[PDB]
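User: Hi! Is it possible to get a structure for several chains at once, not just one? Here's what I have:
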Amino acid sequence: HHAENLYFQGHMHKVKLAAITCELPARSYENDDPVFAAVPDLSESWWQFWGVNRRGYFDPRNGENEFSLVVRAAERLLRSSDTAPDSVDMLICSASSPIMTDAGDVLPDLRGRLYPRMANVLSKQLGLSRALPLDSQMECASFLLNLRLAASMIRQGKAEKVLVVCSEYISNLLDFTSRTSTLFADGCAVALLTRGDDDSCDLLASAEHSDATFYEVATGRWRLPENPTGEAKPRLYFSLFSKMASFVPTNVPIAMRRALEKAGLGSDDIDYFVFHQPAPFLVKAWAEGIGARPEQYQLTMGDTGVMISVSIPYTLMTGLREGKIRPGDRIVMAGAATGWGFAAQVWQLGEVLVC
Amino acid sequence: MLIQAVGVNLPPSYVCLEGPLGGERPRAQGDEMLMQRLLPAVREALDEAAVKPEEIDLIVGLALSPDHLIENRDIMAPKIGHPLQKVLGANRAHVFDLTDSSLARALYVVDTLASDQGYRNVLVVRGESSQGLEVDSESGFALADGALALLCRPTGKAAFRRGALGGDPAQEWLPLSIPLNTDIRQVGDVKGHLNLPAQPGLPEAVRAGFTRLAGDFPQLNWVREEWFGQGRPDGRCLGPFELASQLRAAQRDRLDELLLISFDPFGMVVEGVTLELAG
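Assistant: Yes, the chains can be modeled jointly so their relative placement is included. Here is the combined structure:
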Protein backbone atom coordinates (compact mmCIF):
# COMPACT_ATOMS: atom_id res chain seq x y z
CA HIS A 1 0.00 0.00 0.00
CA HIS A 2 3.05 2.22 -0.49
CA ALA A 3 2.96 3.79 -3.96
CA GLU A 4 -0.18 5.19 -5.58
CA ASN A 5 1.61 5.30 -8.96
CA LEU A 6 4.80 3.80 -10.38
CA TYR A 7 5.89 7.40 -10.96
CA PHE A 8 5.88 10.03 -8.24
CA GLN A 9 3.26 12.75 -7.97
CA GLY A 10 4.32 16.36 -7.84
CA HIS A 11 3.42 18.28 -4.70
CA MET A 12 2.89 21.99 -4.12
CA HIS A 13 5.30 23.34 -1.53
CA LYS A 14 4.04 24.05 1.98
CA VAL A 15 3.69 27.73 2.93
CA LYS A 16 5.19 28.73 6.28
CA LEU A 17 4.06 31.93 7.99
CA ALA A 18 7.41 32.40 9.67
CA ALA A 19 7.44 35.81 11.32
CA ILE A 20 5.28 38.88 11.87
CA THR A 21 5.65 42.32 13.40
CA CYS A 22 3.77 45.61 13.46
CA GLU A 23 4.75 49.25 13.95
CA LEU A 24 2.14 51.70 15.24
CA PRO A 25 2.33 55.49 15.57
CA ALA A 26 3.98 56.81 18.72
CA ARG A 27 1.12 59.21 19.52
CA SER A 28 -2.42 58.18 20.48
CA TYR A 29 -5.53 60.37 20.19
CA GLU A 30 -8.55 60.00 22.50
CA ASN A 31 -12.12 60.58 21.33
CA ASP A 32 -12.15 64.00 23.04
CA ASP A 33 -8.80 65.00 21.52
CA PRO A 34 -8.72 68.48 19.92
CA VAL A 35 -8.08 66.97 16.46
CA PHE A 36 -11.84 66.30 16.38
CA ALA A 37 -12.91 69.82 17.42
CA ALA A 38 -14.35 70.63 13.98
CA VAL A 39 -16.19 67.31 13.54
CA PRO A 40 -19.99 67.77 13.62
CA ASP A 41 -22.73 65.44 14.80
CA LEU A 42 -20.67 63.49 17.33
CA SER A 43 -22.23 61.68 20.27
CA GLU A 44 -21.39 59.02 22.83
CA SER A 45 -23.73 56.78 20.84
CA TRP A 46 -21.47 57.26 17.82
CA TRP A 47 -18.25 56.48 19.68
CA GLN A 48 -19.64 53.49 21.56
CA PHE A 49 -21.04 51.96 18.38
CA TRP A 50 -17.80 51.91 16.40
CA GLY A 51 -15.80 50.56 19.35
CA VAL A 52 -12.76 52.85 18.98
CA ASN A 53 -11.57 54.61 22.14
CA ARG A 54 -8.17 55.79 20.88
CA ARG A 55 -6.14 55.59 17.68
CA GLY A 56 -2.76 56.60 16.25
CA TYR A 57 -1.78 58.97 13.44
CA PHE A 58 1.72 59.20 11.97
CA ASP A 59 3.55 62.41 12.91
CA PRO A 60 5.78 63.28 9.92
CA ARG A 61 7.25 66.17 11.91
CA ASN A 62 8.90 63.50 14.10
CA GLY A 63 9.99 61.37 11.15
CA GLU A 64 7.04 58.97 11.19
CA ASN A 65 5.53 58.09 7.83
CA GLU A 66 4.52 55.10 5.72
CA PHE A 67 8.13 54.41 4.70
CA SER A 68 10.28 55.08 7.78
CA LEU A 69 8.19 52.90 10.10
CA VAL A 70 8.23 50.06 7.56
CA VAL A 71 12.02 50.27 7.28
CA ARG A 72 12.26 50.05 11.07
CA ALA A 73 9.86 47.10 11.31
CA ALA A 74 11.31 45.22 8.34
CA GLU A 75 14.93 45.54 9.51
CA ARG A 76 13.88 44.33 12.98
CA LEU A 77 12.04 41.34 11.54
CA LEU A 78 14.82 40.41 9.12
CA ARG A 79 17.43 40.48 11.90
CA SER A 80 15.27 38.70 14.49
CA SER A 81 14.32 35.98 12.00
CA ASP A 82 17.97 35.66 10.83
CA THR A 83 16.89 36.33 7.23
CA ALA A 84 19.76 37.40 4.98
CA PRO A 85 18.65 40.33 2.79
CA ASP A 86 19.75 38.59 -0.42
CA SER A 87 17.64 35.51 0.41
CA VAL A 88 14.32 37.37 -0.06
CA ASP A 89 12.93 36.40 -3.46
CA MET A 90 9.91 38.73 -3.54
CA LEU A 91 8.69 41.82 -1.72
CA ILE A 92 4.94 42.54 -1.84
CA CYS A 93 3.75 45.89 -0.45
CA SER A 94 0.35 47.47 -0.06
CA ALA A 95 -0.54 51.02 0.96
CA SER A 96 -4.17 52.05 0.56
CA SER A 97 -3.60 55.81 0.49
CA PRO A 98 -2.54 56.93 -3.03
CA ILE A 99 -0.32 59.58 -1.38
CA MET A 100 3.16 58.45 -0.35
CA THR A 101 5.65 60.82 1.24
CA ASP A 102 9.12 59.29 1.75
CA ALA A 103 11.60 57.22 -0.25
CA GLY A 104 14.47 57.09 2.25
CA ASP A 105 18.01 57.26 0.90
CA VAL A 106 16.90 55.85 -2.47
CA LEU A 107 15.01 58.92 -3.76
CA PRO A 108 15.87 61.45 -1.04
CA ASP A 109 14.54 64.57 -2.82
CA LEU A 110 11.05 63.16 -3.48
CA ARG A 111 8.29 64.37 -1.14
CA GLY A 112 4.52 63.93 -1.56
CA ARG A 113 4.02 61.61 -4.51
CA LEU A 114 1.45 59.42 -6.23
CA TYR A 115 4.04 57.17 -7.92
CA PRO A 116 6.22 55.15 -7.64
CA ARG A 117 4.75 52.92 -4.96
CA MET A 118 6.82 51.36 -2.15
CA ALA A 119 8.22 47.93 -3.09
CA ASN A 120 11.04 48.82 -5.49
CA VAL A 121 12.38 51.72 -3.38
CA LEU A 122 12.04 49.63 -0.21
CA SER A 123 13.91 46.66 -1.68
CA LYS A 124 16.80 49.03 -2.44
CA GLN A 125 16.75 50.62 1.02
CA LEU A 126 16.79 47.16 2.67
CA GLY A 127 19.38 45.64 0.31
CA LEU A 128 16.99 42.96 -0.98
CA SER A 129 19.13 42.52 -4.07
CA ARG A 130 17.28 39.43 -5.35
CA ALA A 131 13.70 40.48 -4.49
CA LEU A 132 11.08 40.93 -7.20
CA PRO A 133 9.10 44.01 -6.06
CA LEU A 134 5.33 44.15 -6.32
CA ASP A 135 2.77 46.65 -5.06
CA SER A 136 -0.79 45.35 -4.77
CA GLN A 137 -4.08 46.88 -3.67
CA MET A 138 -7.19 45.25 -2.24
CA GLU A 139 -7.86 48.00 0.34
CA CYS A 140 -8.66 46.60 3.82
CA ALA A 141 -7.94 43.01 2.75
CA SER A 142 -4.53 43.67 1.18
CA PHE A 143 -2.74 41.65 3.85
CA LEU A 144 -4.77 38.58 2.89
CA LEU A 145 -4.24 39.31 -0.79
CA ASN A 146 -0.47 39.46 -0.28
CA LEU A 147 -0.41 36.26 1.77
CA ARG A 148 -2.32 34.62 -1.09
CA LEU A 149 0.07 36.00 -3.72
CA ALA A 150 3.08 34.93 -1.65
CA ALA A 151 1.59 31.50 -0.99
CA SER A 152 0.92 30.79 -4.67
CA MET A 153 4.47 31.82 -5.62
CA ILE A 154 5.89 29.55 -2.90
CA ARG A 155 3.58 26.63 -3.72
CA GLN A 156 4.61 26.68 -7.38
CA GLY A 157 8.34 26.93 -6.58
CA LYS A 158 8.72 30.48 -7.91
CA ALA A 159 9.88 31.96 -4.59
CA GLU A 160 11.38 30.51 -1.42
CA LYS A 161 11.10 33.61 0.81
CA VAL A 162 8.55 36.42 0.45
CA LEU A 163 8.44 39.57 2.58
CA VAL A 164 4.96 41.11 2.90
CA VAL A 165 4.38 44.73 3.89
CA CYS A 166 1.20 46.70 4.57
CA SER A 167 1.61 50.38 5.45
CA GLU A 168 -1.45 52.57 6.04
CA TYR A 169 -1.03 56.35 6.12
CA ILE A 170 -4.79 56.78 5.89
CA SER A 171 -4.76 59.92 8.04
CA ASN A 172 -3.39 61.91 5.07
CA LEU A 173 -6.80 61.36 3.40
CA LEU A 174 -9.07 62.10 6.40
CA ASP A 175 -11.37 65.14 6.36
CA PHE A 176 -11.33 66.29 9.99
CA THR A 177 -14.27 68.61 9.30
CA SER A 178 -16.28 65.40 8.76
CA ARG A 179 -17.44 62.49 10.89
CA THR A 180 -15.71 60.28 8.32
CA SER A 181 -12.38 61.06 10.03
CA THR A 182 -13.20 59.43 13.36
CA LEU A 183 -12.54 55.70 12.83
CA PHE A 184 -9.62 55.03 10.46
CA ALA A 185 -6.06 55.10 11.78
CA ASP A 186 -2.44 54.56 10.77
CA GLY A 187 -0.10 51.62 11.22
CA CYS A 188 2.23 49.17 9.51
CA ALA A 189 2.73 45.39 9.40
CA VAL A 190 5.47 43.14 8.06
CA ALA A 191 5.40 39.35 7.66
CA LEU A 192 7.74 36.71 6.25
CA LEU A 193 6.51 33.65 4.37
CA THR A 194 8.82 30.83 3.31
CA ARG A 195 8.80 27.40 1.72
CA GLY A 196 8.03 25.03 4.58
CA ASP A 197 10.46 22.24 5.40
CA ASP A 198 7.76 20.12 7.08
CA ASP A 199 3.97 19.90 7.42
CA SER A 200 3.66 22.11 10.50
CA CYS A 201 2.42 25.21 8.62
CA ASP A 202 0.43 25.63 5.43
CA LEU A 203 -2.24 27.73 3.74
CA LEU A 204 -4.85 24.98 3.43
CA ALA A 205 -7.22 27.03 1.24
CA SER A 206 -8.43 30.54 0.55
CA ALA A 207 -11.41 32.19 -1.12
CA GLU A 208 -11.52 35.69 -2.61
CA HIS A 209 -14.49 37.40 -4.23
CA SER A 210 -15.67 40.91 -4.99
CA ASP A 211 -18.95 42.74 -5.47
CA ALA A 212 -19.05 46.29 -6.85
CA THR A 213 -22.76 46.94 -6.30
CA PHE A 214 -21.94 49.52 -3.60
CA TYR A 215 -18.62 50.71 -5.04
CA GLU A 216 -19.57 54.39 -4.78
CA VAL A 217 -20.32 54.23 -1.05
CA ALA A 218 -16.70 54.38 0.17
CA THR A 219 -14.22 56.19 -2.07
CA GLY A 220 -11.22 58.46 -2.29
CA ARG A 221 -12.35 61.56 -4.15
CA TRP A 222 -10.76 64.90 -4.96
CA ARG A 223 -12.99 67.45 -3.22
CA LEU A 224 -13.21 70.38 -0.83
CA PRO A 225 -13.68 69.74 2.91
CA GLU A 226 -17.17 68.80 4.06
CA ASN A 227 -17.37 71.91 6.29
CA PRO A 228 -14.62 74.20 5.01
CA THR A 229 -13.37 77.57 6.16
CA GLY A 230 -11.29 80.25 4.50
CA GLU A 231 -9.62 79.51 1.18
CA ALA A 232 -9.64 75.72 1.50
CA LYS A 233 -7.97 73.79 -1.27
CA PRO A 234 -9.26 70.55 -2.82
CA ARG A 235 -7.62 67.39 -1.51
CA LEU A 236 -7.90 63.64 -1.97
CA TYR A 237 -10.29 62.69 0.84
CA PHE A 238 -11.93 59.53 2.07
CA SER A 239 -15.60 60.02 1.23
CA LEU A 240 -18.75 58.19 2.35
CA PHE A 241 -21.95 58.31 0.27
CA SER A 242 -25.22 57.88 2.20
CA LYS A 243 -29.39 50.33 1.62
CA MET A 244 -26.34 48.11 2.10
CA ALA A 245 -28.12 46.31 4.96
CA SER A 246 -26.71 42.78 5.23
CA PHE A 247 -24.16 43.13 2.41
CA VAL A 248 -20.97 43.23 4.49
CA PRO A 249 -22.44 41.07 7.32
CA THR A 250 -23.15 38.17 4.94
CA ASN A 251 -20.30 38.28 2.42
CA VAL A 252 -17.39 37.60 4.80
CA PRO A 253 -19.14 34.41 6.00
CA ILE A 254 -19.67 33.48 2.33
CA ALA A 255 -15.91 33.74 1.81
CA MET A 256 -15.21 31.75 4.99
CA ARG A 257 -17.63 28.96 4.01
CA ARG A 258 -16.03 28.73 0.56
CA ALA A 259 -12.52 28.56 2.03
CA LEU A 260 -13.49 25.90 4.57
CA GLU A 261 -15.25 23.87 1.87
CA LYS A 262 -12.14 24.02 -0.31
CA ALA A 263 -10.02 22.95 2.68
CA GLY A 264 -12.38 20.06 3.42
CA LEU A 265 -12.98 21.37 6.93
CA GLY A 266 -15.88 22.67 8.98
CA SER A 267 -16.14 25.54 11.41
CA ASP A 268 -15.88 23.07 14.31
CA ASP A 269 -12.40 22.10 13.08
CA ILE A 270 -11.12 25.67 13.59
CA ASP A 271 -9.33 26.64 16.79
CA TYR A 272 -9.33 30.41 16.38
CA PHE A 273 -10.49 33.23 14.12
CA VAL A 274 -8.83 36.49 13.07
CA PHE A 275 -11.13 39.16 11.61
CA HIS A 276 -10.78 42.58 10.04
CA GLN A 277 -11.81 45.16 12.66
CA PRO A 278 -14.28 47.69 11.17
CA ALA A 279 -16.74 47.67 14.08
CA PRO A 280 -17.77 45.32 16.92
CA PHE A 281 -21.22 44.64 15.46
CA LEU A 282 -19.68 43.62 12.11
CA VAL A 283 -17.06 41.32 13.64
CA LYS A 284 -19.79 39.74 15.78
CA ALA A 285 -22.07 39.29 12.76
CA TRP A 286 -19.23 37.63 10.85
CA ALA A 287 -18.44 35.36 13.80
CA GLU A 288 -22.07 34.34 14.30
CA GLY A 289 -22.48 33.70 10.58
CA ILE A 290 -19.70 31.07 10.67
CA GLY A 291 -20.29 29.67 14.16
CA ALA A 292 -17.36 31.33 15.95
CA ARG A 293 -17.85 32.00 19.66
CA PRO A 294 -16.59 35.19 21.32
CA GLU A 295 -13.82 33.21 23.07
CA GLN A 296 -12.47 32.25 19.61
CA TYR A 297 -11.53 35.77 18.41
CA GLN A 298 -10.48 39.21 19.60
CA LEU A 299 -11.74 42.73 19.09
CA THR A 300 -8.69 44.96 18.73
CA MET A 301 -9.92 48.24 17.21
CA GLY A 302 -10.53 49.73 20.67
CA ASP A 303 -7.00 51.08 21.19
CA THR A 304 -5.71 51.24 17.59
CA GLY A 305 -8.57 52.46 15.42
CA VAL A 306 -9.38 50.75 12.13
CA MET A 307 -5.98 50.48 10.44
CA ILE A 308 -7.26 49.55 6.96
CA SER A 309 -5.21 46.55 5.79
CA VAL A 310 -3.14 46.39 9.03
CA SER A 311 -5.97 45.48 11.43
CA ILE A 312 -5.84 41.80 10.40
CA PRO A 313 -2.05 41.32 10.87
CA TYR A 314 -2.15 43.36 14.09
CA THR A 315 -4.94 41.09 15.39
CA LEU A 316 -3.09 37.95 14.32
CA MET A 317 0.01 39.19 16.15
CA THR A 318 -2.00 40.04 19.26
CA GLY A 319 -3.49 36.55 19.36
CA LEU A 320 -0.10 34.88 19.02
CA ARG A 321 1.49 37.24 21.57
CA GLU A 322 -1.26 36.65 24.15
CA GLY A 323 -1.37 32.87 23.69
CA LYS A 324 -4.83 32.84 22.11
CA ILE A 325 -3.34 31.26 18.98
CA ARG A 326 -0.89 28.42 19.55
CA PRO A 327 1.48 26.37 17.39
CA GLY A 328 -0.45 23.62 15.65
CA ASP A 329 -3.71 25.57 15.61
CA ARG A 330 -5.91 25.72 12.56
CA ILE A 331 -7.25 29.25 12.13
CA VAL A 332 -9.43 31.25 9.77
CA MET A 333 -8.47 34.80 8.81
CA ALA A 334 -11.13 36.84 7.03
CA GLY A 335 -12.19 40.36 6.21
CA ALA A 336 -14.03 42.77 3.94
CA ALA A 337 -12.72 45.70 1.91
CA THR A 338 -14.18 48.69 0.11
CA GLY A 339 -14.64 48.19 -3.61
CA TRP A 340 -15.95 45.83 -2.39
CA GLY A 341 -13.92 42.70 -1.74
CA PHE A 342 -13.95 39.74 0.61
CA ALA A 343 -11.27 37.23 1.51
CA ALA A 344 -10.87 34.25 3.83
CA GLN A 345 -7.97 31.90 4.50
CA VAL A 346 -7.73 28.59 6.34
CA TRP A 347 -4.27 28.15 7.89
CA GLN A 348 -2.54 25.33 9.65
CA LEU A 349 -0.08 27.31 11.77
CA GLY A 350 3.22 26.17 13.19
CA GLU A 351 5.49 28.31 15.30
CA VAL A 352 5.28 31.97 14.29
CA LEU A 353 7.97 34.38 15.45
CA VAL A 354 6.43 37.54 16.87
CA CYS A 355 9.12 40.23 16.80
CA MET B 1 -0.64 32.08 -19.39
CA LEU B 2 -2.71 31.80 -22.58
CA ILE B 3 -4.04 34.94 -24.29
CA GLN B 4 -7.60 34.17 -25.43
CA ALA B 5 -8.30 37.58 -26.94
CA VAL B 6 -7.04 41.14 -27.05
CA GLY B 7 -9.14 44.29 -27.04
CA VAL B 8 -7.89 47.82 -27.51
CA ASN B 9 -9.56 51.21 -27.69
CA LEU B 10 -7.65 54.45 -28.08
CA PRO B 11 -8.81 58.06 -28.40
CA PRO B 12 -8.69 59.42 -31.95
CA SER B 13 -6.83 62.50 -30.70
CA TYR B 14 -3.03 62.52 -30.96
CA VAL B 15 -0.72 65.11 -29.38
CA CYS B 16 2.92 65.71 -30.32
CA LEU B 17 5.50 66.68 -27.70
CA GLU B 18 9.05 67.74 -28.61
CA GLY B 19 12.12 66.65 -26.70
CA PRO B 20 14.38 63.61 -26.37
CA LEU B 21 11.62 61.58 -24.68
CA GLY B 22 8.84 63.10 -26.77
CA GLY B 23 6.68 61.77 -29.55
CA GLU B 24 3.17 61.69 -30.95
CA ARG B 25 0.88 59.79 -28.60
CA PRO B 26 -2.88 59.31 -28.13
CA ARG B 27 -4.27 61.82 -25.65
CA ALA B 28 -7.72 61.99 -24.10
CA GLN B 29 -9.51 65.31 -24.59
CA GLY B 30 -12.03 67.36 -22.64
CA ASP B 31 -13.44 65.37 -19.73
CA GLU B 32 -13.29 62.01 -21.47
CA MET B 33 -12.67 59.30 -18.90
CA LEU B 34 -11.14 55.84 -18.92
CA MET B 35 -14.28 53.69 -18.69
CA GLN B 36 -15.52 55.11 -22.01
CA ARG B 37 -12.64 53.27 -23.68
CA LEU B 38 -11.99 50.42 -21.24
CA LEU B 39 -15.51 48.99 -21.41
CA PRO B 40 -15.53 48.63 -25.24
CA ALA B 41 -12.02 47.16 -25.22
CA VAL B 42 -13.08 44.56 -22.63
CA ARG B 43 -16.27 43.74 -24.53
CA GLU B 44 -14.29 43.34 -27.74
CA ALA B 45 -12.06 40.75 -26.05
CA LEU B 46 -15.02 38.91 -24.50
CA ASP B 47 -16.90 38.80 -27.81
CA GLU B 48 -13.88 37.46 -29.70
CA ALA B 49 -13.33 34.65 -27.19
CA ALA B 50 -17.09 34.01 -26.78
CA VAL B 51 -16.75 34.43 -23.00
CA LYS B 52 -19.62 35.93 -21.01
CA PRO B 53 -19.07 38.51 -18.24
CA GLU B 54 -20.53 36.11 -15.67
CA GLU B 55 -17.72 33.69 -16.55
CA ILE B 56 -14.91 36.07 -15.50
CA ASP B 57 -13.13 34.73 -12.41
CA LEU B 58 -10.63 37.53 -11.86
CA ILE B 59 -10.10 41.17 -12.89
CA VAL B 60 -6.72 42.80 -12.32
CA GLY B 61 -6.21 46.45 -13.24
CA LEU B 62 -3.28 48.74 -14.03
CA ALA B 63 -3.96 52.48 -14.32
CA LEU B 64 -1.89 55.39 -13.04
CA SER B 65 -4.39 58.18 -13.88
CA PRO B 66 -5.47 59.95 -10.66
CA ASP B 67 -8.88 61.08 -12.02
CA HIS B 68 -11.00 60.83 -15.16
CA LEU B 69 -11.39 57.11 -14.50
CA ILE B 70 -15.20 56.84 -14.41
CA GLU B 71 -18.43 58.83 -14.75
CA ASN B 72 -17.58 60.77 -11.59
CA ARG B 73 -14.29 62.22 -12.83
CA ASP B 74 -13.18 63.10 -9.29
CA ILE B 75 -12.99 59.53 -7.92
CA MET B 76 -9.53 58.01 -7.65
CA ALA B 77 -10.15 54.94 -5.46
CA PRO B 78 -11.03 52.17 -5.19
CA LYS B 79 -9.41 51.48 -8.54
CA ILE B 80 -11.02 50.94 -11.88
CA GLY B 81 -11.34 47.14 -11.74
CA HIS B 82 -14.26 47.60 -9.32
CA PRO B 83 -16.53 49.89 -11.38
CA LEU B 84 -15.55 47.70 -14.34
CA GLN B 85 -16.89 44.62 -12.55
CA LYS B 86 -20.12 46.53 -11.90
CA VAL B 87 -20.81 47.82 -15.40
CA LEU B 88 -19.59 44.59 -17.00
CA GLY B 89 -21.76 42.36 -14.82
CA ALA B 90 -18.84 40.11 -13.78
CA ASN B 91 -20.68 39.14 -10.64
CA ARG B 92 -18.44 36.17 -9.70
CA ALA B 93 -15.07 37.87 -10.20
CA HIS B 94 -12.42 38.71 -7.67
CA VAL B 95 -10.98 42.20 -8.27
CA PHE B 96 -7.65 43.75 -7.36
CA ASP B 97 -5.02 46.14 -8.70
CA LEU B 98 -1.25 45.92 -9.18
CA THR B 99 -0.64 49.71 -9.13
CA ASP B 100 2.60 50.64 -10.95
CA SER B 101 3.55 47.12 -12.08
CA SER B 102 4.51 46.48 -15.66
CA LEU B 103 2.07 44.43 -17.71
CA ALA B 104 4.65 41.65 -18.04
CA ARG B 105 5.17 41.37 -14.27
CA ALA B 106 1.41 41.51 -13.69
CA LEU B 107 0.74 38.71 -16.20
CA TYR B 108 3.36 36.51 -14.51
CA VAL B 109 1.99 37.07 -10.99
CA VAL B 110 -1.62 36.64 -12.17
CA ASP B 111 -0.77 33.44 -14.06
CA THR B 112 0.62 32.10 -10.77
CA LEU B 113 -2.31 33.11 -8.55
CA ALA B 114 -5.01 32.25 -11.06
CA SER B 115 -3.69 28.81 -11.99
CA ASP B 116 -3.21 28.04 -8.29
CA GLN B 117 -6.82 29.01 -7.54
CA GLY B 118 -8.15 27.08 -10.55
CA TYR B 119 -9.55 30.07 -12.45
CA ARG B 120 -10.39 29.69 -16.15
CA ASN B 121 -11.16 33.25 -17.38
CA VAL B 122 -9.02 36.17 -16.17
CA LEU B 123 -9.11 39.78 -17.36
CA VAL B 124 -5.93 41.85 -17.10
CA VAL B 125 -6.55 45.46 -18.13
CA ARG B 126 -4.32 48.49 -18.63
CA GLY B 127 -5.54 52.01 -19.29
CA GLU B 128 -4.98 55.72 -18.93
CA SER B 129 -7.05 58.89 -19.20
CA SER B 130 -4.27 61.12 -17.95
CA GLN B 131 -5.73 64.63 -18.01
CA GLY B 132 -4.95 64.90 -14.28
CA LEU B 133 -1.19 64.48 -14.80
CA GLU B 134 0.97 67.29 -16.15
CA VAL B 135 3.22 66.12 -18.97
CA ASP B 136 6.98 66.57 -18.67
CA SER B 137 7.50 69.52 -20.99
CA GLU B 138 11.27 69.53 -20.32
CA SER B 139 11.84 66.00 -21.62
CA GLY B 140 8.68 65.52 -23.69
CA PHE B 141 7.57 62.47 -21.71
CA ALA B 142 3.85 61.75 -21.58
CA LEU B 143 1.72 58.68 -21.03
CA ALA B 144 -0.26 57.30 -23.93
CA ASP B 145 -4.01 57.36 -23.25
CA GLY B 146 -6.40 54.51 -24.06
CA ALA B 147 -7.31 51.01 -22.85
CA LEU B 148 -6.00 47.48 -23.42
CA ALA B 149 -7.81 44.32 -22.31
CA LEU B 150 -6.22 40.87 -22.19
CA LEU B 151 -8.59 37.97 -21.65
CA CYS B 152 -6.41 35.10 -20.45
CA ARG B 153 -6.58 31.47 -19.43
CA PRO B 154 -3.95 30.76 -16.74
CA THR B 155 -1.61 27.80 -17.05
CA GLY B 156 0.98 28.36 -14.30
CA LYS B 157 3.73 27.86 -16.91
CA ALA B 158 4.58 31.47 -17.78
CA ALA B 159 8.28 32.24 -17.38
CA PHE B 160 9.56 35.66 -16.33
CA ARG B 161 12.65 37.84 -16.64
CA ARG B 162 13.56 41.25 -15.21
CA GLY B 163 16.50 42.70 -17.12
CA ALA B 164 18.70 45.78 -17.28
CA LEU B 165 18.46 48.51 -19.87
CA GLY B 166 21.04 48.40 -22.64
CA GLY B 167 23.32 51.16 -23.79
CA ASP B 168 26.17 52.32 -21.58
CA PRO B 169 26.25 49.84 -18.66
CA ALA B 170 27.82 52.58 -16.50
CA GLN B 171 24.86 54.90 -17.21
CA GLU B 172 22.70 55.47 -14.13
CA TRP B 173 19.20 55.98 -15.54
CA LEU B 174 16.96 58.50 -13.79
CA PRO B 175 13.48 57.03 -13.19
CA LEU B 176 9.99 58.36 -13.70
CA SER B 177 8.31 59.87 -10.67
CA ILE B 178 4.87 61.44 -10.26
CA PRO B 179 5.05 63.95 -7.39
CA LEU B 180 1.81 65.35 -6.02
CA ASN B 181 0.72 68.83 -7.14
CA THR B 182 1.41 70.98 -4.08
CA ASP B 183 -0.84 73.82 -5.32
CA ILE B 184 -4.20 72.29 -6.21
CA ARG B 185 -6.72 75.13 -6.36
CA GLN B 186 -9.63 73.70 -8.38
CA VAL B 187 -10.97 70.14 -8.35
CA GLY B 188 -10.09 69.92 -12.05
CA ASP B 189 -6.43 70.90 -11.68
CA VAL B 190 -3.66 68.39 -12.33
CA LYS B 191 -3.12 66.15 -9.31
CA GLY B 192 0.50 65.30 -10.08
CA HIS B 193 3.34 65.97 -12.49
CA LEU B 194 5.19 63.51 -14.71
CA ASN B 195 8.91 63.88 -14.09
CA LEU B 196 11.25 61.86 -16.32
CA PRO B 197 14.51 63.77 -16.82
CA ALA B 198 15.70 64.38 -20.38
CA GLN B 199 18.00 61.44 -21.23
CA PRO B 200 18.65 61.29 -24.98
CA GLY B 201 19.97 57.71 -25.01
CA LEU B 202 17.09 56.28 -22.97
CA PRO B 203 14.77 55.19 -25.83
CA GLU B 204 17.56 53.18 -27.44
CA ALA B 205 18.68 51.78 -24.07
CA VAL B 206 15.15 50.42 -23.60
CA ARG B 207 15.09 48.84 -27.06
CA ALA B 208 18.55 47.32 -26.44
CA GLY B 209 17.26 46.03 -23.10
CA PHE B 210 14.33 44.41 -24.92
CA THR B 211 16.66 42.71 -27.40
CA ARG B 212 18.96 41.41 -24.65
CA LEU B 213 16.04 39.94 -22.68
CA ALA B 214 14.58 38.32 -25.80
CA GLY B 215 17.89 36.46 -26.07
CA ASP B 216 16.86 34.46 -23.00
CA PHE B 217 14.13 32.90 -25.17
CA PRO B 218 15.69 32.91 -28.66
CA GLN B 219 13.20 30.35 -29.99
CA LEU B 220 10.29 32.74 -29.36
CA ASN B 221 8.93 35.58 -31.44
CA TRP B 222 8.29 38.63 -29.30
CA VAL B 223 6.19 41.77 -28.85
CA ARG B 224 7.13 44.94 -26.96
CA GLU B 225 5.87 48.26 -25.62
CA GLU B 226 7.03 51.52 -27.24
CA TRP B 227 7.01 54.43 -24.81
CA PHE B 228 9.04 56.92 -26.88
CA GLY B 229 8.77 58.45 -30.34
CA GLN B 230 12.53 58.66 -30.93
CA GLY B 231 13.46 56.69 -34.03
CA ARG B 232 9.85 55.52 -34.57
CA PRO B 233 7.96 56.19 -37.83
CA ASP B 234 6.43 59.68 -37.63
CA GLY B 235 7.58 59.80 -34.02
CA ARG B 236 4.32 58.04 -33.14
CA CYS B 237 4.13 55.61 -30.24
CA LEU B 238 1.35 54.03 -28.21
CA GLY B 239 3.14 53.02 -25.02
CA PRO B 240 1.94 49.62 -23.77
CA PHE B 241 -1.00 49.89 -26.18
CA GLU B 242 1.50 49.09 -28.96
CA LEU B 243 1.11 45.46 -27.86
CA ALA B 244 -2.35 45.09 -29.39
CA SER B 245 -1.38 45.21 -33.07
CA GLN B 246 1.63 42.96 -32.45
CA LEU B 247 -0.42 40.32 -30.61
CA ARG B 248 -3.09 40.32 -33.32
CA ALA B 249 -0.40 39.89 -35.99
CA ALA B 250 0.97 36.95 -34.01
CA GLN B 251 -2.54 35.48 -33.94
CA ARG B 252 -2.95 35.97 -37.70
CA ASP B 253 0.32 34.09 -38.27
CA ARG B 254 -0.94 31.27 -36.01
CA LEU B 255 1.86 31.46 -33.46
CA ASP B 256 1.08 29.32 -30.41
CA GLU B 257 3.67 30.96 -28.12
CA LEU B 258 5.47 34.29 -27.76
CA LEU B 259 7.44 36.54 -25.41
CA LEU B 260 5.93 39.84 -24.23
CA ILE B 261 8.31 42.55 -23.00
CA SER B 262 7.36 45.65 -20.98
CA PHE B 263 9.34 48.74 -20.04
CA ASP B 264 9.00 49.78 -16.38
CA PRO B 265 9.81 53.53 -16.22
CA PHE B 266 9.73 53.50 -12.40
CA GLY B 267 12.30 50.75 -11.96
CA MET B 268 14.17 51.61 -15.17
CA VAL B 269 14.17 47.94 -16.15
CA VAL B 270 12.59 45.77 -18.82
CA GLU B 271 10.43 42.80 -17.86
CA GLY B 272 9.36 39.88 -20.02
CA VAL B 273 6.79 37.10 -19.71
CA THR B 274 6.26 34.05 -21.92
CA LEU B 275 2.73 33.40 -23.16
CA GLU B 276 0.63 30.98 -25.15
CA LEU B 277 -1.78 32.18 -27.82
CA ALA B 278 -5.17 31.25 -29.25
CA GLY B 279 -5.65 30.52 -32.95
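Residues 193 and 274 of chain B are 33 Å apart (CA to CA). The first helix of chain B runs from residue 35 to 49.

User: Great, thank you!
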